[model samples]
Target: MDKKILVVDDEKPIADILEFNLRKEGYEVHCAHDGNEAVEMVEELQPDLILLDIMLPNKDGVEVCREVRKKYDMPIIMLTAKDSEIDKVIGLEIGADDYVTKPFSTRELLARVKANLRRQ
Candidate 1:
């Protein structure tokens, strides 16, 4: 079976771009547009990795990260729009393995995904 990735972003364009790139890399992908739905999908999908947005509706990324960590050992790489260190630090504290700031290049994003996957 193919490796699986769950991408949670409220922005449709971002999710689509991620899916396009991830699929091209030969991984199966799933997406959710809200924090609640994203968490629900994660439970059902049980993806090998997760690329989560820092801001989300209904539950928020921090909450989702906390809840998901309670059950999953999978790596999570947060996607943030903020350049501040605080948000990045908070994400790591909540169990996010890494992060990619918004406007990140696809090359770097793919590199990050590859590197994180290699660790597990």
Candidate 2:
């Protein structure tokens, strides 16, 4: 099966860009617009990997990551703003596999996704 990627970001343009790029690379992409929906989808879809944004409504990425880590071991690559302090701590502390800062290039993000999926 093609790899499944769940993209969790409140920003429609960012999410849409990710979905488009991921699909072009032959991934099956699913998107959620908020932290609560993201967690719910993770349970339902059991996707191979997740691209999770740090700032979100309802739960926030840290809480979402914490919740998901309790049940699943899928690779989660956090999407963080360049100036956020949380970005530095979230990876090892929250059990996310990796992270990329915002204003990131699609090529770079896709490479991270591929590398993480390869590790899996």
Candidate 3:
């Protein structure tokens, strides 16, 4: 099956980068530029996984994850800024499946993506 992945970030370049790499890795990719849009897309598309930014406009990634998790059981990997101090809540409190900080290696992100998808 063609697994769909939703990439949500306020940064356009980051979103494009993730979309490009994920598509290259053979997954169907979609993007949302903000948290609200991310939630809407999650509901409509029901992607197999999500790459959500923690510091997003409108709703924020933590809240978005909380909301999405309330209904969907799909994997959610947070995309946090390298300087942000959200390392603790990323997986435990926010309920993310995994996380990749900014300036992250594509290889590592791809690995996490594969790992999370494999768990489903």
lDDT agreement of model 2 with the native: 0.89
RMSD of 2: 1.4
Q: Kindly report which residue stretches of model 1 are placed more than 4 angstroms away from their true locations once superposed.
A: none
TM-score-based ranking = 1, 2, 3
Residue lDDT tens for model 2, 1-120: 999999999899999999999999999999999877988999999999999987878448888889999999999998888887767566658789889888999889889999999893
TM-score of each: 0.93, 0.92, 0.90
Q: Model 2 — TM-score against the truth?
A: 0.92
C-alpha lDDT score of every prediction, in listed order:
0.89, 0.89, 0.86
What TM value does model 3 have? Answer: 0.90
Candidate 3's C-alpha runs over 4 A off are none
Best by TM-score: 1
lDDT of 1 by residue, 3-107 (tens): 899999989999999999999989999998888887899988899999998888843888889999999989999998766787777888889999999888889
Worst 10 residues of 2 by lDDT: 84-93
Poorest lDDT segment (10 consecutive residues) of candidate 1: 81-90
**Candidate 1 C-alpha RMSD relative to the actual structure:** 1.4
